[PDB]
Amino acid sequence: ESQAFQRQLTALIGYDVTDVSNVHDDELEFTRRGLVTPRMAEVASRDPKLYAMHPWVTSKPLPEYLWKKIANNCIFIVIHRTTSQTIKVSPDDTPGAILQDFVLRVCGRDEYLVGETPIKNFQWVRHCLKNGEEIHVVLDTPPDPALDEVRKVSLWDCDRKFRVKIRGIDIPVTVFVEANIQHGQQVLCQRRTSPKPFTEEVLWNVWLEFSIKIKDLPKGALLNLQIYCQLLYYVNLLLIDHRFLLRRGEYVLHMWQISFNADKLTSATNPDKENSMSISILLDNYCHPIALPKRAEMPNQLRKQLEAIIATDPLNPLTAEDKELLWHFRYESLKHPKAYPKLFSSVKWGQQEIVAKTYQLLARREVWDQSALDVGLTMQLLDCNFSDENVRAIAVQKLESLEDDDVLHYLLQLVQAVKFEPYHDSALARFLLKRGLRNKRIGHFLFWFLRSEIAQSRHYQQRFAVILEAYLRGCGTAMLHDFTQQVQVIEMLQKVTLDIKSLSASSQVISQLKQKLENLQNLPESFRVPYDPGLKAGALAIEKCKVMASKKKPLWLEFKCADPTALSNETIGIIFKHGDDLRQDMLILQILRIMESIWETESLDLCLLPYGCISTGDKIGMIEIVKDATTIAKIQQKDEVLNHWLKEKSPTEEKFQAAVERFVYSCAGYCVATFVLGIGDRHNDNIMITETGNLFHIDFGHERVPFVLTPDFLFVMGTSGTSPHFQKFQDICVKAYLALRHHTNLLIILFSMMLMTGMKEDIEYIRDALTVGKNEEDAKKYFLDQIEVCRDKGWTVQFNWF
Numbered sequence: 001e002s003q004a005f006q007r008q009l010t011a012l013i014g015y016d017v018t019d020v021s022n023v024h025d026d027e028l029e030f031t032r033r034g035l036v037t038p039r040m041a042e043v044a045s046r047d048p049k050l051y052a053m054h055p056w057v058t059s060k061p062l063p064e065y066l067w068k069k070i071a072n073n074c075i076f077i078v079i080h081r082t083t084s085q086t087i088k089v090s091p092d093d094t095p096g097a098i099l100q101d102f103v104l105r106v107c108g109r110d111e112y113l114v115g116e117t118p119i120k121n122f123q124w125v126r127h128c129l130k131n132g133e134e135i136h137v138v139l140d141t142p143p144d145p146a147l148d149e150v151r152k153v154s155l156w157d158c159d160r161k162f163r164v165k166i167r168g169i170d171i172p173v174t175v176f177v178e179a180n181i182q183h184g185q186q187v188l189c190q191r192r193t194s195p196k197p198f199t200e201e202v203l204w205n206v207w208l209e210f211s212i213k214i215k216d217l218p219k220g221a222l223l224n225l226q227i228y229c230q231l232l233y234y235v236n237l238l239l240i241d242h243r244f245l246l247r248r249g250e251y252v253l254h255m256w257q258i259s260f261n262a263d264k265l266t267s268a269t270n271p272d273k274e275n276s277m278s279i280s281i282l283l284d285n286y287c288h289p290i291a292l293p294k295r296a297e298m299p300n301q302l303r304k305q306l307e308a309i310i311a312t313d314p315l316n317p318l319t320a321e322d323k324e325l326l327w328h329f330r331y332e333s334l335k336h337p338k339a340y341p342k343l344f345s346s347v348k349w350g351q352q353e354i355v356a357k358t359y360q361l362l363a364r365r366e367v368w369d370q371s372a373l374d375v376g377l378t379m380q381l382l383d384c385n386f387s388d389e390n391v392r393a394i395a396v397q398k399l400e401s402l403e404d405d406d407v408l409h410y411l412l413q414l415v416q417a418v419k420f421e422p423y424h425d426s427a428l429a430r431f432l433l434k435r436g437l438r439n440k441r442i443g444h445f446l447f448w449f450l451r452s453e454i455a456q457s458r459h460y461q462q463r464f465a466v467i468l469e470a471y472l473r474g475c476g477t478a479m480l481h482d483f484t485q486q487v488q489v490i491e492m493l494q495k496v497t498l499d500i501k502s503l504s505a506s507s508q509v510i511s512q513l514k515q516k517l518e519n520l521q522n523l524p525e526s527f528r529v530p531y532d533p534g535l536k537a538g539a540l541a542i543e544k545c546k547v548m549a550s551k552k553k554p555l556w557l558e559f560k561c562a563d564p565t566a567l568s569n570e571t572i573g574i575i576f577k578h579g580d581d582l583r584q585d586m587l588i589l590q591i592l593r594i595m596e597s598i599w600e601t602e603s604l605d606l607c608l609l610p611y612g613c614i615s616t617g618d619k620i621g622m623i624e625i626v627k628d629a630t631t632i633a634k635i636q637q638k639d640e641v642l643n644h645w646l647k648e649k650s651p652t653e654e655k656f657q658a659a660v661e662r663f664v665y666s667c668a669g670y671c672v673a674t675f676v677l678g679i680g681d682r683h684n685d686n687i688m689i690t691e692t693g694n695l696f697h698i699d700f701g702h703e704r705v706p707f708v709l710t711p712d713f714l715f716v717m718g719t720s721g722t723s724p725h726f727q728k729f730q731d732i733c734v735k736a737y738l739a740l741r742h743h744t745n746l747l748i749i750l751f752s753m754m755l756m757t758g759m760k761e762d763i764e765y766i767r768d769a770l771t772v773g774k775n776e777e778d779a780k781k782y783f784l785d786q787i788e789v790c791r792d793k794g795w796t797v798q799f800n801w802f
């Protein structure tokens with residue numbers, strides 16, 4: 001009756017929030033309760049007119065390469081209604097001024113040109129100008145905002161030393177327990193139990209007295225229990241709870257097994273109980289509830305020493321002297337926003353006094369607030385190394401400066417960063433709740449970015465599910481309708497992918513596929529595309545649908561577009577795959593999209609193709625089909641072969657000369673990008689190219705060479721084992737490489753988090769690849785040398801690949 005809505009949300013999320021069986025406290029229920037207010041606040045504050053039409057706009061400057069297309073200076077936008085007419089408009093002209101009521105929707109898209117924004121500052125206008133396409137719009141009627149209607153004793157006096165009683169470890173099928181007090185990645189104090197023979201049950205009943213006191217336990221503290229026999233099981237328990245109270249009583253904790261990592265920081269217990277390892281522990285209880293309460297300059301030499309510490313890379317660890325230097329002169333270090341991550345590492349979190357000294361130091365934020373926004377440091381303070389609620393919130397406060405365009409560039413990386421938050425309700429989760437609820441595009445990607453983890457991560461599904469339910473409860477009836485239509489389709493397409501895979505390691509398979517898709521089309525008739533929400537896919541082209549030939553078996557699906565106002569009847573091609581982890585490809589594609597923005601600021605377009613890719617469920621998702629594209633393997637199935645393929649598929653010579661240029665930029669782009677990320681040693685079948693000349697890597701799901709610059713690519717430029725194109729390539733390569741190096745800290749910390757949340761020494765790769773330390777001229781030469789490593793090898797490495 002009154003519960004029907006929750007069972008609808010339950011099916012959208014893919015996990016039950018009301019079901020509380022793997023919970024030892026009430027944090028999820030308390031954060032479900034606490035999340036109501038920032039949803040109520042956002043639902044109410046959003047302009048219902050601009051919420052319904054979600055104009056995807058930017059406040060960033062129009063790039064160098066895009067002002068080349070505009071001349072007079074005017075742009076042509078063709079308005080449709082059967083009868084169409086072109087209108088010459090100034091780049092700085094508002095959409096209403098063009099209209100001279102009615103709205104300017106994009107043809108075949110739920111994309112609109114609205115608000116007090118210049119047309120040059122629209123993401124669809126910039127997109128068309130980049131791709132050299134016409135701006136086809138339609139004089140449509142604004143959508144009803146009615147469709148989005150939303151349904152409605154003190155701690156610092158407990159000077160006693162802390163202790164935990166290790167009762168034992170009950171397991172269904174030598175060993176010792178390692179008890180740790182943790183804050184960030186920094187272990188405060190360790191204690192082990194005496195080794196005992198490994199059996200079905202191992203009792204100890206011994207108390208482990210720690211060096212740290214109750215008073216000195218920081219908000220965010222963790223009792224991390226580990227089972228060593230060398231590490232085999234782990235579990236965590238927040239010593240300070242959500243209601244600021246120290247943990248008391250008996251706790252049985254089901255432990256996570258093994259095979260550093262974000263999964264190893266989780267406060268959640270293992271849901272499996274009949275097969276998992278447990279741990280009975282006792283925590284000292286009291287009659288009254290224990291509750292946590294709330295100059296000189298610097299000499300020229302010690303200034304230079306501190307300046308060198310700030311200027312180093314994030315991965316560079318601080319010594320004991322570096323930590324003392326930074327802490328003593330914290331008031332100076334506070335006047336340099338770049339020192340904050342390193343300074344907040346230098347503080348002794350296991351000392352109530354040193355913590356209180358930081359908390360009051362942070363009240364002098366006049367300098368941090370007034371600073372120019374840096375995503376680098378903001379992401380730095382949100383990682384595993386920072387467990388303090390206050391420090392993290394200073395980073396979340398800067399995320400408010402980010403306009404909807406930028407929130408989209410880091411939505412996935414911010415969603416992952418929630419894994420490092422000690423408590424469920426956090427400034428970050430709330431931040432992602434505001435931005436998702438304010439914007440429909442952000443909200444759509446939020447849904448899928450959260451649903452990605454809820455369905456595959458047993459470690460963080462609990463936390464993420466309460467954040468999804470909170471977003472869902474405020475998006476409005478329209479988005480809730482759209483998501484049911486997406487869930488219903490992917491859940492339908494999930495069975496088909498799995499049933500077909502359970503028939504192969506042919507005509508039988510291809511007939512059985514259409515035999516199943518037939519009893520599927522007879523709901524829904526339309527659904528938004530999870531990786532491109534503007535595009536609405538209609539009914540299937542069941543005759544075009546096939547099962548793909550590789551080691552894995554994906555579903556090549558083609559859907560007609562639901563919008564009849566579309567320019568072409570070109571179907572929407574979607575790959576539905578199983579057995580591969582799309583969570584890592586999502587992460588790689590995101591850094592690629594970030595790299596492009598870095599190049600945009602530096603006035604460069606390296607023509608990357610970061611194809612839509614959404615992780616949907618348990619090792620299953622969907623991938624965008626790139627139209628008129630094939631792999632290098634299919635083009636070979638040597639030197640001449642690619643340039644012969646480009647001319648052959650090219651209509652005019654004008655278009656071919658465009659095809660070789662689109663090749664040099666995209667090739668240089670994938671050369672710099674895949675090198676930095678360390679995914680350049682890839683097989684020919686994992687490198688694609690459009691009939692337009694647009695090259696792009698794929699299958700990112702986890703002798704040597706730095707990148708792929710084979711002779712067939714070189715022959716396209718006009719070189720065999722210099723050229724006017726190869727010189728243009730080398731120059732744009734360096735120009736692109738040096739741009740990414742200006743954002744070292746950003747890339748370093750983006751990669752670091754990517755590793756921990758998606759997948760110590762492995763991370764160190766970007767230090768060397770982004771040539772940390774070396775000057776602008778030394779890096780130019782270093783990259784040009786890596787070009788020559790590909791020239792020397794040629795077909796060697798490509799041949800080596802089995």
Ligand SMILES: Cn1c(=O)n(C2CCOCC2)c2c3cc(-c4cccnc4)ccc3ncc21
Pocket residue numbers: 548550575577585611623624625626627629630631685698699700
């Ligand atoms: C025409 N055509 C293909 O043949 N294929 C492939 C199918 C699987 O064998 C490799 C080639 C693709 C595409 C494959 C991906 C992709 C698939 C899995 C992982 N990462 C990326 C993306 C876009 C694509 N577009 C077009 C297209």
